[PDB]
PDB file of all heavy atoms in Angstrom:
ATOM      1  N   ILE O   1      -0.024  -7.454  -6.682  1.00 55.96           N
ATOM      2  CA  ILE O   1      -1.403  -7.834  -6.479  1.00 55.96           C
ATOM      3  C   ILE O   1      -2.314  -6.787  -7.091  1.00 55.96           C
ATOM      4  O   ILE O   1      -3.251  -7.114  -7.824  1.00 55.96           O
ATOM      5  CB  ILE O   1      -1.712  -8.017  -5.000  1.00 55.96           C
ATOM      6  CG1 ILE O   1      -0.804  -9.099  -4.424  1.00 55.96           C
ATOM      7  CG2 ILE O   1      -3.177  -8.401  -4.812  1.00 55.96           C
ATOM      8  CD1 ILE O   1      -0.910  -9.260  -2.932  1.00 55.96           C
ATOM      9  N   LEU O   2      -2.004  -5.523  -6.827  1.00 56.01           N
ATOM     10  CA  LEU O   2      -2.778  -4.409  -7.373  1.00 56.01           C
ATOM     11  C   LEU O   2      -2.536  -4.193  -8.867  1.00 56.01           C
ATOM     12  O   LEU O   2      -2.951  -3.176  -9.420  1.00 56.01           O
ATOM     13  CB  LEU O   2      -2.452  -3.114  -6.626  1.00 56.01           C
ATOM     14  CG  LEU O   2      -2.472  -3.112  -5.099  1.00 56.01           C
ATOM     15  CD1 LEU O   2      -1.802  -1.858  -4.547  1.00 56.01           C
ATOM     16  CD2 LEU O   2      -3.871  -3.265  -4.542  1.00 56.01           C
ATOM     17  N   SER O   3      -1.851  -5.133  -9.512  1.00 54.48           N
ATOM     18  CA  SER O   3      -1.519  -5.008 -10.927  1.00 54.48           C
ATOM     19  C   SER O   3      -0.953  -3.625 -11.264  1.00 54.48           C
ATOM     20  O   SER O   3      -1.209  -3.080 -12.339  1.00 54.48           O
ATOM     21  CB  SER O   3      -2.746  -5.318 -11.792  1.00 54.48           C
ATOM     22  OG  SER O   3      -2.975  -6.711 -11.862  1.00 54.48           O
ATOM     23  N   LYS O   4      -0.179  -3.061 -10.343  1.00 54.38           N
ATOM     24  CA  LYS O   4       0.360  -1.719 -10.528  1.00 54.38           C
ATOM     25  C   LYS O   4       1.718  -1.720 -11.212  1.00 54.38           C
ATOM     26  O   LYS O   4       2.361  -0.681 -11.334  1.00 54.38           O
ATOM     27  CB  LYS O   4       0.454  -1.004  -9.186  1.00 54.38           C
ATOM     28  CG  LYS O   4      -0.869  -0.496  -8.714  1.00 54.38           C
ATOM     29  CD  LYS O   4      -0.759   0.240  -7.392  1.00 54.38           C
ATOM     30  CE  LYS O   4      -2.088   0.972  -7.104  1.00 54.38           C
ATOM     31  NZ  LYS O   4      -2.353   1.226  -5.645  1.00 54.38           N
ATOM     32  N   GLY O   5       2.149  -2.890 -11.664  1.00 53.77           N
ATOM     33  CA  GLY O   5       3.502  -3.048 -12.165  1.00 53.77           C
ATOM     34  C   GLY O   5       4.482  -2.853 -11.026  1.00 53.77           C
ATOM     35  O   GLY O   5       4.085  -2.629  -9.884  1.00 53.77           O
ATOM     36  N   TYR O   6       5.768  -2.919 -11.326  1.00 54.55           N
ATOM     37  CA  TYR O   6       6.752  -2.917 -10.263  1.00 54.55           C
ATOM     38  C   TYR O   6       8.060  -2.270 -10.675  1.00 54.55           C
ATOM     39  O   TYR O   6       8.158  -1.701 -11.763  1.00 54.55           O
ATOM     40  CB  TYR O   6       6.979  -4.343  -9.778  1.00 54.55           C
ATOM     41  CG  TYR O   6       7.609  -5.269 -10.789  1.00 54.55           C
ATOM     42  CD1 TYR O   6       8.902  -5.750 -10.593  1.00 54.55           C
ATOM     43  CD2 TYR O   6       6.917  -5.679 -11.935  1.00 54.55           C
ATOM     44  CE1 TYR O   6       9.499  -6.614 -11.505  1.00 54.55           C
ATOM     45  CE2 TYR O   6       7.510  -6.544 -12.866  1.00 54.55           C
ATOM     46  CZ  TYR O   6       8.808  -7.009 -12.635  1.00 54.55           C
ATOM     47  OH  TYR O   6       9.435  -7.863 -13.512  1.00 54.55           O
ATOM     48  N   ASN O   7       9.053  -2.363  -9.788  1.00 55.53           N
ATOM     49  CA  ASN O   7      10.388  -1.761  -9.954  1.00 55.53           C
ATOM     50  C   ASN O   7      11.309  -2.241  -8.841  1.00 55.53           C
ATOM     51  O   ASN O   7      10.880  -2.957  -7.946  1.00 55.53           O
ATOM     52  CB  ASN O   7      10.304  -0.252  -9.822  1.00 55.53           C
ATOM     53  CG  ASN O   7      10.029   0.176  -8.392  1.00 55.53           C
ATOM     54  OD1 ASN O   7       9.369  -0.540  -7.625  1.00 55.53           O
ATOM     55  ND2 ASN O   7      10.540   1.335  -8.020  1.00 55.53           N
ATOM     56  N   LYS O   8      12.552  -1.778  -8.852  1.00 55.97           N
ATOM     57  CA  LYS O   8      13.572  -2.221  -7.893  1.00 55.97           C
ATOM     58  C   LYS O   8      13.052  -2.396  -6.460  1.00 55.97           C
ATOM     59  O   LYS O   8      13.576  -3.207  -5.698  1.00 55.97           O
ATOM     60  CB  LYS O   8      14.772  -1.264  -7.928  1.00 55.97           C
ATOM     61  CG  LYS O   8      15.381  -1.122  -9.319  1.00 55.97           C
ATOM     62  CD  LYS O   8      16.276   0.091  -9.473  1.00 55.97           C
ATOM     63  CE  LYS O   8      17.015   0.025 -10.805  1.00 55.97           C
ATOM     64  NZ  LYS O   8      17.942   1.158 -10.960  1.00 55.97           N
ATOM     65  N   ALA O   9      12.008  -1.656  -6.108  1.00 59.26           N
ATOM     66  CA  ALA O   9      11.494  -1.645  -4.742  1.00 59.26           C
ATOM     67  C   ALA O   9      10.927  -2.979  -4.238  1.00 59.26           C
ATOM     68  O   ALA O   9      11.085  -3.290  -3.052  1.00 59.26           O
ATOM     69  CB  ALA O   9      10.458  -0.562  -4.590  1.00 59.26           C
ATOM     70  N   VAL O  10      10.263  -3.753  -5.111  1.00 57.28           N
ATOM     71  CA  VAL O  10       9.634  -4.998  -4.682  1.00 57.28           C
ATOM     72  C   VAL O  10      10.620  -5.886  -3.984  1.00 57.28           C
ATOM     73  O   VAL O  10      10.237  -6.728  -3.173  1.00 57.28           O
ATOM     74  CB  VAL O  10       9.097  -5.826  -5.819  1.00 57.28           C
ATOM     75  CG1 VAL O  10       7.818  -5.264  -6.295  1.00 57.28           C
ATOM     76  CG2 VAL O  10      10.131  -5.940  -6.913  1.00 57.28           C
ATOM     77  N   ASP O  11      11.895  -5.718  -4.309  1.00 57.62           N
ATOM     78  CA  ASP O  11      12.897  -6.579  -3.738  1.00 57.62           C
ATOM     79  C   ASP O  11      12.956  -6.344  -2.244  1.00 57.62           C
ATOM     80  O   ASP O  11      13.034  -7.298  -1.478  1.00 57.62           O
ATOM     81  CB  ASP O  11      14.237  -6.419  -4.458  1.00 57.62           C
ATOM     82  CG  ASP O  11      14.218  -7.029  -5.876  1.00 57.62           C
ATOM     83  OD1 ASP O  11      13.316  -7.837  -6.226  1.00 57.62           O
ATOM     84  OD2 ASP O  11      15.121  -6.706  -6.661  1.00 57.62           O
ATOM     85  N   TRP O  12      12.826  -5.089  -1.829  1.00 59.60           N
ATOM     86  CA  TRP O  12      12.901  -4.748  -0.395  1.00 59.60           C
ATOM     87  C   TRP O  12      11.707  -5.262   0.411  1.00 59.60           C
ATOM     88  O   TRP O  12      11.855  -5.675   1.567  1.00 59.60           O
ATOM     89  CB  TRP O  12      13.103  -3.248  -0.196  1.00 59.60           C
ATOM     90  CG  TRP O  12      14.224  -2.702  -1.029  1.00 59.60           C
ATOM     91  CD1 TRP O  12      14.149  -1.697  -1.948  1.00 59.60           C
ATOM     92  CD2 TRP O  12      15.570  -3.165  -1.055  1.00 59.60           C
ATOM     93  NE1 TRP O  12      15.375  -1.485  -2.525  1.00 59.60           N
ATOM     94  CE2 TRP O  12      16.264  -2.380  -2.001  1.00 59.60           C
ATOM     95  CE3 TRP O  12      16.256  -4.173  -0.377  1.00 59.60           C
ATOM     96  CZ2 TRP O  12      17.609  -2.555  -2.275  1.00 59.60           C
ATOM     97  CZ3 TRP O  12      17.602  -4.351  -0.645  1.00 59.60           C
ATOM     98  CH2 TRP O  12      18.267  -3.546  -1.588  1.00 59.60           C
ATOM     99  N   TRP O  13      10.533  -5.245  -0.214  1.00 60.57           N
ATOM    100  CA  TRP O  13       9.396  -5.988   0.305  1.00 60.57           C
ATOM    101  C   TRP O  13       9.807  -7.447   0.532  1.00 60.57           C
ATOM    102  O   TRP O  13       9.605  -8.008   1.616  1.00 60.57           O
ATOM    103  CB  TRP O  13       8.207  -5.931  -0.663  1.00 60.57           C
ATOM    104  CG  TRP O  13       7.004  -6.677  -0.124  1.00 60.57           C
ATOM    105  CD1 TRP O  13       6.718  -8.010  -0.286  1.00 60.57           C
ATOM    106  CD2 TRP O  13       5.955  -6.142   0.700  1.00 60.57           C
ATOM    107  NE1 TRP O  13       5.550  -8.331   0.378  1.00 60.57           N
ATOM    108  CE2 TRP O  13       5.066  -7.203   0.991  1.00 60.57           C
ATOM    109  CE3 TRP O  13       5.676  -4.865   1.218  1.00 60.57           C
ATOM    110  CZ2 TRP O  13       3.922  -7.022   1.770  1.00 60.57           C
ATOM    111  CZ3 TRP O  13       4.541  -4.691   1.982  1.00 60.57           C
ATOM    112  CH2 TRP O  13       3.679  -5.761   2.253  1.00 60.57           C
ATOM    113  N   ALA O  14      10.377  -8.054  -0.509  1.00 57.34           N
ATOM    114  CA  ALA O  14      10.767  -9.446  -0.448  1.00 57.34           C
ATOM    115  C   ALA O  14      11.663  -9.585   0.762  1.00 57.34           C
ATOM    116  O   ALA O  14      11.362 -10.355   1.690  1.00 57.34           O
ATOM    117  CB  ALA O  14      11.493  -9.861  -1.715  1.00 57.34           C
ATOM    118  N   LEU O  15      12.730  -8.795   0.771  1.00 58.09           N
ATOM    119  CA  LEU O  15      13.704  -8.824   1.833  1.00 58.09           C
ATOM    120  C   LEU O  15      13.003  -8.777   3.175  1.00 58.09           C
ATOM    121  O   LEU O  15      13.314  -9.561   4.089  1.00 58.09           O
ATOM    122  CB  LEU O  15      14.622  -7.625   1.684  1.00 58.09           C
ATOM    123  CG  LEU O  15      15.534  -7.377   2.874  1.00 58.09           C
ATOM    124  CD1 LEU O  15      16.607  -8.489   3.008  1.00 58.09           C
ATOM    125  CD2 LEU O  15      16.153  -6.023   2.698  1.00 58.09           C
ATOM    126  N   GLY O  16      12.051  -7.848   3.264  1.00 59.87           N
ATOM    127  CA  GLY O  16      11.192  -7.717   4.432  1.00 59.87           C
ATOM    128  C   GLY O  16      10.540  -9.046   4.830  1.00 59.87           C
ATOM    129  O   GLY O  16      10.777  -9.582   5.941  1.00 59.87           O
ATOM    130  N   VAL O  17       9.734  -9.596   3.923  1.00 61.17           N
ATOM    131  CA  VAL O  17       9.121 -10.879   4.168  1.00 61.17           C
ATOM    132  C   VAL O  17      10.160 -11.905   4.592  1.00 61.17           C
ATOM    133  O   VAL O  17       9.966 -12.625   5.567  1.00 61.17           O
ATOM    134  CB  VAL O  17       8.428 -11.411   2.928  1.00 61.17           C
ATOM    135  CG1 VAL O  17       7.670 -12.680   3.269  1.00 61.17           C
ATOM    136  CG2 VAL O  17       7.495 -10.376   2.364  1.00 61.17           C
ATOM    137  N   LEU O  18      11.265 -11.970   3.866  1.00 62.24           N
ATOM    138  CA  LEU O  18      12.270 -12.979   4.151  1.00 62.24           C
ATOM    139  C   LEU O  18      12.797 -12.898   5.575  1.00 62.24           C
ATOM    140  O   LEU O  18      12.820 -13.920   6.296  1.00 62.24           O
ATOM    141  CB  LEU O  18      13.442 -12.891   3.159  1.00 62.24           C
ATOM    142  CG  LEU O  18      14.558 -13.933   3.327  1.00 62.24           C
ATOM    143  CD1 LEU O  18      14.000 -15.282   3.005  1.00 62.24           C
ATOM    144  CD2 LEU O  18      15.728 -13.606   2.417  1.00 62.24           C
ATOM    145  N   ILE O  19      13.229 -11.692   5.961  1.00 64.14           N
ATOM    146  CA  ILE O  19      13.776 -11.467   7.304  1.00 64.14           C
ATOM    147  C   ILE O  19      12.748 -11.956   8.314  1.00 64.14           C
ATOM    148  O   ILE O  19      13.068 -12.670   9.288  1.00 64.14           O
ATOM    149  CB  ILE O  19      14.051  -9.988   7.568  1.00 64.14           C
ATOM    150  CG1 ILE O  19      15.315  -9.559   6.858  1.00 64.14           C
ATOM    151  CG2 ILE O  19      14.274  -9.772   9.019  1.00 64.14           C
ATOM    152  CD1 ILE O  19      15.379  -8.080   6.633  1.00 64.14           C
ATOM    153  N   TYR O  20      11.501 -11.583   8.043  1.00 65.36           N
ATOM    154  CA  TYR O  20      10.437 -11.916   8.928  1.00 65.36           C
ATOM    155  C   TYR O  20      10.405 -13.426   9.112  1.00 65.36           C
ATOM    156  O   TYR O  20      10.519 -13.931  10.235  1.00 65.36           O
ATOM    157  CB  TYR O  20       9.132 -11.375   8.381  1.00 65.36           C
ATOM    158  CG  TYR O  20       7.964 -11.586   9.317  1.00 65.36           C
ATOM    159  CD1 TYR O  20       7.306 -10.498   9.906  1.00 65.36           C
ATOM    160  CD2 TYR O  20       7.508 -12.885   9.613  1.00 65.36           C
ATOM    161  CE1 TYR O  20       6.231 -10.702  10.757  1.00 65.36           C
ATOM    162  CE2 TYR O  20       6.439 -13.101  10.464  1.00 65.36           C
ATOM    163  CZ  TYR O  20       5.801 -12.013  11.037  1.00 65.36           C
ATOM    164  OH  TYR O  20       4.729 -12.247  11.887  1.00 65.36           O
ATOM    165  N   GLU O  21      10.304 -14.154   8.008  1.00 63.22           N
ATOM    166  CA  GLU O  21      10.168 -15.583   8.136  1.00 63.22           C
ATOM    167  C   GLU O  21      11.353 -16.165   8.880  1.00 63.22           C
ATOM    168  O   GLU O  21      11.189 -17.044   9.721  1.00 63.22           O
ATOM    169  CB  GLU O  21       9.943 -16.289   6.810  1.00 63.22           C
ATOM    170  CG  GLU O  21       9.644 -17.762   7.056  1.00 63.22           C
ATOM    171  CD  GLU O  21       8.891 -18.455   5.921  1.00 63.22           C
ATOM    172  OE1 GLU O  21       8.497 -17.787   4.925  1.00 63.22           O
ATOM    173  OE2 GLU O  21       8.692 -19.699   6.034  1.00 63.22           O
ATOM    174  N   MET O  22      12.536 -15.651   8.599  1.00 66.26           N
ATOM    175  CA  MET O  22      13.717 -16.143   9.288  1.00 66.26           C
ATOM    176  C   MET O  22      13.621 -15.922  10.789  1.00 66.26           C
ATOM    177  O   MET O  22      13.876 -16.830  11.594  1.00 66.26           O
ATOM    178  CB  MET O  22      14.968 -15.475   8.750  1.00 66.26           C
ATOM    179  CG  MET O  22      15.481 -16.158   7.527  1.00 66.26           C
ATOM    180  SD  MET O  22      16.963 -15.372   6.859  1.00 66.26           S
ATOM    181  CE  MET O  22      16.329 -13.686   6.591  1.00 66.26           C
ATOM    182  N   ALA O  23      13.238 -14.711  11.158  1.00 68.42           N
ATOM    183  CA  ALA O  23      13.235 -14.323  12.552  1.00 68.42           C
ATOM    184  C   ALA O  23      12.066 -14.960  13.264  1.00 68.42           C
ATOM    185  O   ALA O  23      12.192 -15.348  14.420  1.00 68.42           O
ATOM    186  CB  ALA O  23      13.182 -12.815  12.680  1.00 68.42           C
ATOM    187  N   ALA O  24      10.949 -15.084  12.551  1.00 70.35           N
ATOM    188  CA  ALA O  24       9.712 -15.606  13.107  1.00 70.35           C
ATOM    189  C   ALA O  24       9.549 -17.123  13.008  1.00 70.35           C
ATOM    190  O   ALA O  24       8.982 -17.760  13.905  1.00 70.35           O
ATOM    191  CB  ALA O  24       8.557 -14.948  12.444  1.00 70.35           C
ATOM    192  N   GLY O  25      10.036 -17.691  11.913  1.00 71.80           N
ATOM    193  CA  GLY O  25       9.849 -19.094  11.631  1.00 71.80           C
ATOM    194  C   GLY O  25       8.687 -19.272  10.682  1.00 71.80           C
ATOM    195  O   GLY O  25       8.511 -20.327  10.082  1.00 71.80           O
ATOM    196  N   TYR O  26       7.870 -18.239  10.555  1.00 71.44           N
ATOM    197  CA  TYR O  26       6.723 -18.291   9.647  1.00 71.44           C
ATOM    198  C   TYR O  26       6.642 -16.988   8.845  1.00 71.44           C
ATOM    199  O   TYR O  26       7.242 -15.985   9.243  1.00 71.44           O
ATOM    200  CB  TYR O  26       5.408 -18.583  10.414  1.00 71.44           C
ATOM    201  CG  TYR O  26       5.143 -17.692  11.640  1.00 71.44           C
ATOM    202  CD1 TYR O  26       4.701 -16.364  11.491  1.00 71.44           C
ATOM    203  CD2 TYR O  26       5.324 -18.180  12.935  1.00 71.44           C
ATOM    204  CE1 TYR O  26       4.462 -15.550  12.593  1.00 71.44           C
ATOM    205  CE2 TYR O  26       5.086 -17.375  14.041  1.00 71.44           C
ATOM    206  CZ  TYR O  26       4.653 -16.061  13.865  1.00 71.44           C
ATOM    207  OH  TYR O  26       4.402 -15.257  14.964  1.00 71.44           O
ATOM    208  N   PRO O  27       5.920 -16.999   7.714  1.00 70.95           N
ATOM    209  CA  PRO O  27       5.725 -15.801   6.899  1.00 70.95           C
ATOM    210  C   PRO O  27       4.822 -14.821   7.609  1.00 70.95           C
ATOM    211  O   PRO O  27       4.006 -15.253   8.423  1.00 70.95           O
ATOM    212  CB  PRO O  27       5.000 -16.332   5.672  1.00 70.95           C
ATOM    213  CG  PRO O  27       4.347 -17.607   6.143  1.00 70.95           C
ATOM    214  CD  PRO O  27       5.319 -18.188   7.096  1.00 70.95           C
ATOM    215  N   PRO O  28       4.953 -13.512   7.311  1.00 68.24           N
ATOM    216  CA  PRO O  28       4.095 -12.497   7.937  1.00 68.24           C
ATOM    217  C   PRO O  28       2.607 -12.601   7.572  1.00 68.24           C
ATOM    218  O   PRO O  28       1.756 -12.574   8.468  1.00 68.24           O
ATOM    219  CB  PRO O  28       4.698 -11.170   7.466  1.00 68.24           C
ATOM    220  CG  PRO O  28       5.454 -11.496   6.280  1.00 68.24           C
ATOM    221  CD  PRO O  28       5.986 -12.890   6.473  1.00 68.24           C
ATOM    222  N   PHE O  29       2.279 -12.738   6.292  1.00 72.16           N
ATOM    223  CA  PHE O  29       0.874 -12.846   5.934  1.00 72.16           C
ATOM    224  C   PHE O  29       0.647 -14.259   5.525  1.00 72.16           C
ATOM    225  O   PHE O  29       1.480 -14.836   4.839  1.00 72.16           O
ATOM    226  CB  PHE O  29       0.559 -11.895   4.800  1.00 72.16           C
ATOM    227  CG  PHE O  29       1.281 -10.606   4.920  1.00 72.16           C
ATOM    228  CD1 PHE O  29       2.488 -10.409   4.267  1.00 72.16           C
ATOM    229  CD2 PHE O  29       0.785  -9.599   5.735  1.00 72.16           C
ATOM    230  CE1 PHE O  29       3.175  -9.196   4.401  1.00 72.16           C
ATOM    231  CE2 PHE O  29       1.455  -8.391   5.874  1.00 72.16           C
ATOM    232  CZ  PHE O  29       2.651  -8.185   5.207  1.00 72.16           C
ATOM    233  N   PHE O  30      -0.464 -14.816   5.976  1.00 69.62           N
ATOM    234  CA  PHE O  30      -0.822 -16.195   5.710  1.00 69.62           C
ATOM    235  C   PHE O  30      -2.275 -16.302   6.063  1.00 69.62           C
ATOM    236  O   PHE O  30      -2.777 -15.580   6.925  1.00 69.62           O
ATOM    237  CB  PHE O  30      -0.017 -17.166   6.582  1.00 69.62           C
ATOM    238  CG  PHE O  30      -0.148 -16.902   8.061  1.00 69.62           C
ATOM    239  CD1 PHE O  30      -1.163 -17.521   8.802  1.00 69.62           C
ATOM    240  CD2 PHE O  30       0.733 -16.011   8.717  1.00 69.62           C
ATOM    241  CE1 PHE O  30      -1.301 -17.267  10.173  1.00 69.62           C
ATOM    242  CE2 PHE O  30       0.612 -15.751  10.091  1.00 69.62           C
ATOM    243  CZ  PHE O  30      -0.409 -16.380  10.821  1.00 69.62           C
ATOM    244  N   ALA O  31      -2.955 -17.205   5.384  1.00 69.16           N
ATOM    245  CA  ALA O  31      -4.377 -17.396   5.580  1.00 69.16           C
ATOM    246  C   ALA O  31      -4.779 -18.715   4.980  1.00 69.16           C
ATOM    247  O   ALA O  31      -3.938 -19.439   4.427  1.00 69.16           O
ATOM    248  CB  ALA O  31      -5.152 -16.276   4.921  1.00 69.16           C
ATOM    249  N   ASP O  32      -6.072 -19.012   5.084  1.00 67.40           N
ATOM    250  CA  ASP O  32      -6.650 -20.162   4.406  1.00 67.40           C
ATOM    251  C   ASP O  32      -6.604 -20.017   2.877  1.00 67.40           C
ATOM    252  O   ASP O  32      -5.827 -20.696   2.201  1.00 67.40           O
ATOM    253  CB  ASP O  32      -8.078 -20.416   4.894  1.00 67.40           C
ATOM    254  CG  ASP O  32      -8.436 -21.889   4.868  1.00 67.40           C
ATOM    255  OD1 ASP O  32      -7.489 -22.707   4.872  1.00 67.40           O
ATOM    256  OD2 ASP O  32      -9.642 -22.235   4.840  1.00 67.40           O
ATOM    257  N   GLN O  33      -7.422 -19.113   2.351  1.00 67.36           N
ATOM    258  CA  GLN O  33      -7.502 -18.860   0.916  1.00 67.36           C
ATOM    259  C   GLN O  33      -6.533 -17.771   0.466  1.00 67.36           C
ATOM    260  O   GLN O  33      -6.181 -16.895   1.258  1.00 67.36           O
ATOM    261  CB  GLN O  33      -8.924 -18.443   0.545  1.00 67.36           C
ATOM    262  CG  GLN O  33      -9.908 -19.586   0.493  1.00 67.36           C
ATOM    263  CD  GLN O  33      -9.813 -20.375  -0.793  1.00 67.36           C
ATOM    264  OE1 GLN O  33      -8.953 -20.117  -1.639  1.00 67.36           O
ATOM    265  NE2 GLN O  33     -10.712 -21.345  -0.953  1.00 67.36           N
ATOM    266  N   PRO O  34      -6.118 -17.803  -0.818  1.00 68.01           N
ATOM    267  CA  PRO O  34      -5.200 -16.790  -1.358  1.00 68.01           C
ATOM    268  C   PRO O  34      -5.783 -15.393  -1.260  1.00 68.01           C
ATOM    269  O   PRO O  34      -5.084 -14.446  -0.952  1.00 68.01           O
ATOM    270  CB  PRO O  34      -5.057 -17.186  -2.833  1.00 68.01           C
ATOM    271  CG  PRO O  34      -6.274 -18.021  -3.134  1.00 68.01           C
ATOM    272  CD  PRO O  34      -6.538 -18.762  -1.857  1.00 68.01           C
ATOM    273  N   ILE O  35      -7.077 -15.287  -1.509  1.00 65.25           N
ATOM    274  CA  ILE O  35      -7.762 -14.009  -1.498  1.00 65.25           C
ATOM    275  C   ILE O  35      -7.640 -13.316  -0.146  1.00 65.25           C
ATOM    276  O   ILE O  35      -7.411 -12.120  -0.075  1.00 65.25           O
ATOM    277  CB  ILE O  35      -9.235 -14.168  -1.920  1.00 65.25           C
ATOM    278  CG1 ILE O  35      -9.891 -12.803  -2.023  1.00 65.25           C
ATOM    279  CG2 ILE O  35      -9.987 -15.096  -0.966  1.00 65.25           C
ATOM    280  CD1 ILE O  35      -9.200 -11.894  -2.972  1.00 65.25           C
ATOM    281  N   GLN O  36      -7.763 -14.092   0.920  1.00 63.35           N
ATOM    282  CA  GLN O  36      -7.655 -13.571   2.257  1.00 63.35           C
ATOM    283  C   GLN O  36      -6.244 -13.084   2.493  1.00 63.35           C
ATOM    284  O   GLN O  36      -6.042 -12.062   3.129  1.00 63.35           O
ATOM    285  CB  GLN O  36      -8.023 -14.649   3.261  1.00 63.35           C
ATOM    286  CG  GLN O  36      -9.378 -15.284   3.000  1.00 63.35           C
ATOM    287  CD  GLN O  36      -9.673 -16.465   3.901  1.00 63.35           C
ATOM    288  OE1 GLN O  36     -10.807 -16.933   3.965  1.00 63.35           O
ATOM    289  NE2 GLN O  36      -8.652 -16.961   4.599  1.00 63.35           N
ATOM    290  N   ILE O  37      -5.276 -13.818   1.956  1.00 65.14           N
ATOM    291  CA  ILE O  37      -3.868 -13.448   2.060  1.00 65.14           C
ATOM    292  C   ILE O  37      -3.595 -12.109   1.407  1.00 65.14           C
ATOM    293  O   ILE O  37      -3.085 -11.210   2.061  1.00 65.14           O
ATOM    294  CB  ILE O  37      -2.912 -14.552   1.510  1.00 65.14           C
ATOM    295  CG1 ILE O  37      -2.941 -15.772   2.447  1.00 65.14           C
ATOM    296  CG2 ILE O  37      -1.485 -14.015   1.333  1.00 65.14           C
ATOM    297  CD1 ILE O  37      -2.263 -17.020   1.937  1.00 65.14           C
TER     298      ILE O  37
END
């Protein structure tokens, strides 16, 4: 989002989000508009 480019690490963020959705049933960040997200 910050246009900072990326590296192997983003995957662990992903993993993070994924686990969350699995455990929660929903994604961690969510909103009406994309900008708010």
Side-chain angles (χ1 to χ4, degrees):
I1 301 173
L2 311 166
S3 283
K4 282 181 169 155
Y6 66 112
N7 71 329
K8 304 163 171 183
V10 282
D11 288 344
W12 310 123
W13 181 272
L15 169 69
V17 186
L18 182 67
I19 284 158
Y20 185 115
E21 187 158 356
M22 276 179 303
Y26 50 76
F29 322 95
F30 56 90
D32 212 21
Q33 283 280 4
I35 185 57
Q36 307 173 168
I37 291 170

